[PDB]
Scaffold this active site. Structure first.
Site, PDB file in Angstrom:
ATOM      1  N   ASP A 188       3.507  -5.739  -6.415  1.00 45.22           N
ATOM      2  CA  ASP A 188       4.318  -5.874  -5.220  1.00 45.22           C
ATOM      3  C   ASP A 188       3.750  -6.857  -4.184  1.00 45.22           C
ATOM      4  O   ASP A 188       4.195  -6.887  -3.055  1.00 45.22           O
ATOM      5  CB  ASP A 188       4.480  -4.484  -4.610  1.00 45.22           C
ATOM      6  CG  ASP A 188       3.208  -3.856  -4.031  1.00 45.22           C
ATOM      7  OD1 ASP A 188       2.078  -4.316  -4.208  1.00 45.22           O
ATOM      8  OD2 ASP A 188       3.368  -2.854  -3.363  1.00 45.22           O
ATOM      9  N   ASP A 209      -5.404  -4.278  -3.499  1.00 43.68           N
ATOM     10  CA  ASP A 209      -6.329  -3.162  -3.408  1.00 43.68           C
ATOM     11  C   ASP A 209      -7.775  -3.602  -3.151  1.00 43.68           C
ATOM     12  O   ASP A 209      -8.286  -4.547  -3.779  1.00 43.68           O
ATOM     13  CB  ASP A 209      -6.299  -2.347  -4.706  1.00 43.68           C
ATOM     14  CG  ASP A 209      -5.067  -1.458  -4.889  1.00 43.68           C
ATOM     15  OD1 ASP A 209      -4.253  -1.274  -3.988  1.00 43.68           O
ATOM     16  OD2 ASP A 209      -4.925  -0.945  -5.987  1.00 43.68           O
ATOM     17  N   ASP A 256      -2.571  12.663   2.928  1.00 44.53           N
ATOM     18  CA  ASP A 256      -1.163  12.295   3.160  1.00 44.53           C
ATOM     19  C   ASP A 256      -0.059  13.032   2.377  1.00 44.53           C
ATOM     20  O   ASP A 256       1.148  12.831   2.558  1.00 44.53           O
ATOM     21  CB  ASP A 256      -1.029  10.772   2.921  1.00 44.53           C
ATOM     22  CG  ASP A 256       0.195  10.134   3.593  1.00 44.53           C
ATOM     23  OD1 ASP A 256       0.255  10.040   4.825  1.00 44.53           O
ATOM     24  OD2 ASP A 256       1.105   9.736   2.857  1.00 44.53           O
TER      25      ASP A 256
END
Length: 129
Positions: free
Chosen positions: A48, A52, A101
């Site tokens: 995308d 990282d 999260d």
């Protein structure tokens, strides 16, 4: 820096990731192994367009700022280059918000595919105690 296995387990323990959000130290060491091969300087581009960064391959899409990732949230309020340091403090501080999260350590697809379900305490074997 390229960390030794026990050396990184030590650093990770001291920085508080052992049992962080229920994940034992072997889980975090196994994920660093397969994300970065214990190399703080590891960088890998995703399909995308985000990248990282570091020992736990923290994504520029949601977590750190690198300037070249449209949509970047920068939720660890950090430049991505800071995740590449010899000292893992910032990578651990950011990892603690990612594991919290909602999806736990499934956030790390290398942990989900390799490590999860396996004997992860093998990763802290022979290490000082």
């Amino acid at each position: 820096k390229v960390f030794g296995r026990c050396e990184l387990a030590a650093a990770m323990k001291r920085h508080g990731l052992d049992n962080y959000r229920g994940y034992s130290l072997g889980n975090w060491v196994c994920a660093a192994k397969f994300e970065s091969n214990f190399n703080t300087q590891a960088t890998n581009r995703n399909t995308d367009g985000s990248t990282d960064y570091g020992i736990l391959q923290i994504n520029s899409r949601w977590w750190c700022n690198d300037g070249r990732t449209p949509g970047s949230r920068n939720l660890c309020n950090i430049p991505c280059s800071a995740l590449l340091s010899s000292d893992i403090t910032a990578s651990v501080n950011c990892a603690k918000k990612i594991v919290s999260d909602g999806n736990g350590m499934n956030a790390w697809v290398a942990w989900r595919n390799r490590c999860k379900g396996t004997d992860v305490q093998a990763w802290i074997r022979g290490c000082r105690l």
